[PDB]
Amino acid sequence: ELPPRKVCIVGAGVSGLYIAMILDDLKIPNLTYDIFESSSRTGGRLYTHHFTDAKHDYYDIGAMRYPDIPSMKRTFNLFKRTGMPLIKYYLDGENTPQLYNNHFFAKGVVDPYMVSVANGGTVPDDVVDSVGEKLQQAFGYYKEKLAEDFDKGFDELMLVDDMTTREYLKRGGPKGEAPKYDFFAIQWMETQNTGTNLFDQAFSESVIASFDFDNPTKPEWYCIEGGTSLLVDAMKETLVHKVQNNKRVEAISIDLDAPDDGNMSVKIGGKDYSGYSTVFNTTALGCLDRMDLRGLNLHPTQADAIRCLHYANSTKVALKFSYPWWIKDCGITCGGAASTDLPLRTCVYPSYNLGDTGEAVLLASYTWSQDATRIGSLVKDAPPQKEDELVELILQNLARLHAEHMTYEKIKEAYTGVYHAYCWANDPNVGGAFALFGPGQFSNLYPYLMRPAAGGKFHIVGEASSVHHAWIIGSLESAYTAVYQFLYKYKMWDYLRLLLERWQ
Amino acid sequence: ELPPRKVCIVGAGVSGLYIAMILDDLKIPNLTYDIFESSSRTGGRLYTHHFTDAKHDYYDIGAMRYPDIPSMKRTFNLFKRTGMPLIKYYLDGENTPQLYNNHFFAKGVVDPYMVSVANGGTVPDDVVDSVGEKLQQAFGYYKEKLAEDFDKGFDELMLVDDMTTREYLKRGGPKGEAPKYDFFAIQWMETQNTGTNLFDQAFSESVIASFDFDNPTKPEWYCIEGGTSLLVDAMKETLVHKVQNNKRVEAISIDLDAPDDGNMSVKIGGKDYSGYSTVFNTTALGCLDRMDLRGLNLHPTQADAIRCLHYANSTKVALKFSYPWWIKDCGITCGGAASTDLPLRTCVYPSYNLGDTGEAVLLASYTWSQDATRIGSLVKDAPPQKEDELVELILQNLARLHAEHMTYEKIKEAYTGVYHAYCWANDPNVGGAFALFGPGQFSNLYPYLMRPAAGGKFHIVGEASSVHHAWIIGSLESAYTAVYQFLYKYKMWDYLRLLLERWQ
Ligand SMILES: Cc1cc2nc3c(=O)[nH]c(=O)nc-3n(C[C@H](O)[C@H](O)[C@H](O)COP(=O)(O)OP(=O)(O)OC[C@H]3O[C@@H](n4cnc5c(N)ncnc54)[C@H](O)[C@@H]3O)c2cc1C
Ligand SMILES: Cc1cc2nc3c(=O)[nH]c(=O)nc-3n(C[C@H](O)[C@H](O)[C@H](O)COP(=O)(O)OP(=O)(O)OC[C@H]3O[C@@H](n4cnc5c(N)ncnc54)[C@H](O)[C@@H]3O)c2cc1C
Helix, strand or coil, X not given: CCCCEEEEEXXXXXXXXXXXXXXXXXXXXXXXXXXXXXXXXXXXXXXXXXXXXXXXXXXXXXXXXXXXXXXXXXXXXXXXXXXXXXXXXXXXXXXXXXXXXXXXXXXXXXXXXXXXXXXXXXXXXXXXXXXXXXXXXXXXXXXXXXXXXXXXXXXXXXXXXXXXXXXXXXXXXXXXXXXXXXXXXXXXXXXXXCCCCHHHCEHHHHHHHHHHHCCCCCCCEEEECCCCHHHHHHHHHXXXXXXXXXXXXXXXXXXCCXXXXXCEEEEECCEEEEEECEXXXXXXXXXXXXXXXXXXXXXXXHHHHHHHCCEECEEEEEEXXXXXXXXXXXXXXXXXXXXXXXXXXXXXXXXCXXXXXXXXXXXXXXXXXXXXXXXXXXXXXXXXCCCCHHHHHHHHHHHHHCCCCCCHHHHHHHEEEEEEEEEHHHCXXXXXXXECCCCCHHHHXXXXXXXXXXXXXXXXXXXXXXXXXXXXXXHHHHHHHHHHHHXXXXXXXXXXXXXXXXXX | CCCCEEEEEECCEHHHHHXXXXXXXXXXXXXXXXXXXXXXXXXXXXXXXECCCCCCCEEECCCCCEECCHHHHHHHHHHHHCCCCEEEECCCCCCCCEEECCEECCCCCCCCCCCEHHHCCCECHHHHCCHHHHHHHHHHHHHHHHHHCHHHHHHXXXXXXXXXXXXXXXXXXXXXXXXXXXXXXXXXXXXXXCCCCHHHCEHHHHHHHHHHHCCCCCCCEEEECCCCHHHHHHHHHCCCCCCECCCCEEEEEECCCCCCCCCEEEEECCEEEEEECEEEECCCHHHHHHCEXXXXXXXXXXXXXXXXXXXXXXXXXXXXXXXXXXXXXXCCCCCCEEEECCCCCEEECCCCCCCCCCCEEEEEEEEEHHHHHXXXXXXXXXXXXXXXXXXXXXXXXXXXXXXXXXXXXXXXXXXXXXXXXXXXXXXXXXXXXXXXXXXXXXXXXXXXXXXXXXXXXXXXXXXXXXXXXXXXHHHHHHHHHHHHHHHHHCCCHXXXXXXXXXXX
């Protein structure tokens, strides 16, 4: 009795696969879909790089770690539904070094990095050792509201969304009744908390990032043993209609003079694909902006949101060593991460090879923003044919960062000559790592990004289309909400009730 | 009687070549220098790409245009000293289209782009047509102070340097007595004035940019016939000591226990080069941050400036056509530029091929910031080889932007299949296009960047080391100031007096 209908899913990241997974589970009679993926690869920002097929010879280029907090239960539900082999992830480990101003951190010492005014620096003495307390004071009220109810705490956070993190810290909040900090105190707080320049983005983003990385529930963290791409594999195998790779959508349109439900079309390589009742676009917004969307007649501020919503860059560099020297020689036995102001910024010790004593991968450099753009400028699609500036830079920084136990020569001799790096802003299928909004964008541009378009038949889906940026959870919520709206638009009340019964 | 001395110049851009030109002209007895260039190319961000040896078959990847205003007289003096063939450059031309929200601009039309509140958009009615007036009111006081005396106007501008452009517009200046604007008005001003997200950088940078591109003196603009690289060529030939290419410095140091003047050294590819009495680093700050600078004992805030001073990205795309269809079919006969919210953002019509009737180059895309990062994600150093997504995107955008007189088919027909593109953040020898400081950086971090180091023997030189970012003038001022300090440091009063006499 339900008429035949076809929907189009643009992009086969976790968002589009989740839409397909929900539709497949609902089994709506005479409903079909097409998934078009621009890349020859499926998975998007779920991307494990395997150095061999040996058990632990990999690293995750995209998503890799997941906190067990209530706001991410849909992600863990997806893990359980697919049989993902989860293991513990150590956000903090043992003996992980911290190196700033060429000094190592030491507990119970005043200004161990020698950056305070008292030791010839410009960081105020009352700030240099108290970045944790002072940011917890700036973020904590909003963080606990988000712990009660995320949507409600987000709505209250939006009342100060016009401010950057720096502007909030400089002026003492929205009416000056919080502590006010000078430039260098804010500069030190950013250096100790996030990537270079990121306090010049939205205050609300810094709050939510601290909520996810420093949650008040003090959560357990998890990784997928074997790499996150195992999740992509599992979602691929269940698909009723398989992904069509090497199909880049360059135009999306609706024919408003046609009476049928299936009056939407996409253009791929100059050829029309029509007959769609709804199009789900799941790409990053930069890819969407490059399409010809005139046939959708989008609201001008919705088009503005696609162009202007800010993305942060990110770069990862992973090196293979003949043995885990950080474990055996430095005593770094349970993961964690080493932070520094040296160019590599963050060195992540894998949680998934703690028992291995042979070949081991180190995530030697993990950067955001300008740090990632600078490292990324050394990352090529065809690495040079000993002469690699990036390798040499990483080995030198690793030696300085682990100087308490290692030499440059010992680290260099342990290096096998095999490495991989990836800069997400250089990926043509994303154009960045993830949404990280500027001041006022969440409260002003974001609502127009989600506004109904094409008479409720076009949906902009993905991590940037949610309140949970740079996490899998944002992709899943966005995709679920868009399926809701699709079922609502066509008054499929039986299956809408089933969607809420099964997937809410 | 002057003892033998040797100085090191790191980098052979216009900064490094200007230091050598000044030293060559002073002819200081027994003074020599080394200039090391990491690239196999000399010139840095002076970089003309030649599509053949044909006369006008080129475009400038880096610097290309020069306003004849008093604060850039040193640049124009370098042009005359080197006999550069200057021709007029047309910043504004005739019949250049402007395309926003799929509508073309027309003077005297109220809200031609249909973005105002009255027409379904969110841009306030009183802002939509008066962006130039309202930005002139926000920038104008400081622009005229900069026109009287640049350094005095700069010093006064620094008293509001804590604010971003957006923040100045939102709060009505530093005490709320200027007009206050809501998010969408500021958003439209940014869209009409500069690159995506740049109003979230320093207010002082938006003032200085307006001062240079929209100077109160209404100046003549110039370009170098044959491309800017002719300047690099002329500076190279006069060199007493030739540039040593493929010499990447990775460490700079001074041995303070040594009594000699020549107690500084640099490391290149693991090898030591010593004997230097002064080291001029002229690299972009990202390249400086990658070096091992411990042997210099830099002030911690100076190191912070090196790492955190913000750079903007920039991407250029140039296409060759079999005839200048923008001249012949669209009436765009006098250079100028076309602006749009489409991904190409800005289409620059060359001023050096206005009389040609055959093959002609178009600078089809010129972008900054996130616009440039997005276009740059399609720019590969090994071009794809008809499958080129970037080419097709440019052709489609060019057709929509020139739809009043051209079709996609005719533009594609005229395209020869020869194009070149460049994204400066992907260049390992820069890591960006140019300094574009964030809020508070000019007044807080920049003074420590210029602070005396290694007892007055180490200098950080280049466009980022000046009050004139993204211009050749900043590079020359910075190099001149560094030569001054070198002569002062060694008490060479005769030659310091000669520097003032010849080079001020
Ligand atoms: C460096 C990094 C680390 C991360 N770490 C974590 C982590 O630890 N934990 C976590 O939970 N999350 C993490 N994330 C976030 C997570 O990876 C993403 O939020 C999620 O994978 C986004 O999926 P998506 O489907 O929304 O978008 P995408 O993964 O980008 O999928 C969109 C797809 O559309 C395709 N496409 C693009 N253009 C077109 C076109 N024109 N036509 C057709 N298809 C097109 C793309 O190729 C892509 O496959 C990380 C992200 C990054 C960048
Ligand atoms: C897209 C763009 C457009 C521009 N347009 C204009 C314009 O119209 N007008 C204008 O006046 N200005 C313009 N500029 C600015 C102008 O190009 C620059 O200000 C100037 O060229 C910079 O000169 P520099 O010597 O300070 O730096 P650079 O040109 O960067 O010189 C530094 C040199 O150091 C080298 N180097 C780097 N690392 C090392 C190392 N470790 N060891 C040794 N050498 C190293 C680099 O290869 C480079 O040659 C533009 C800039 C850009 C990016």
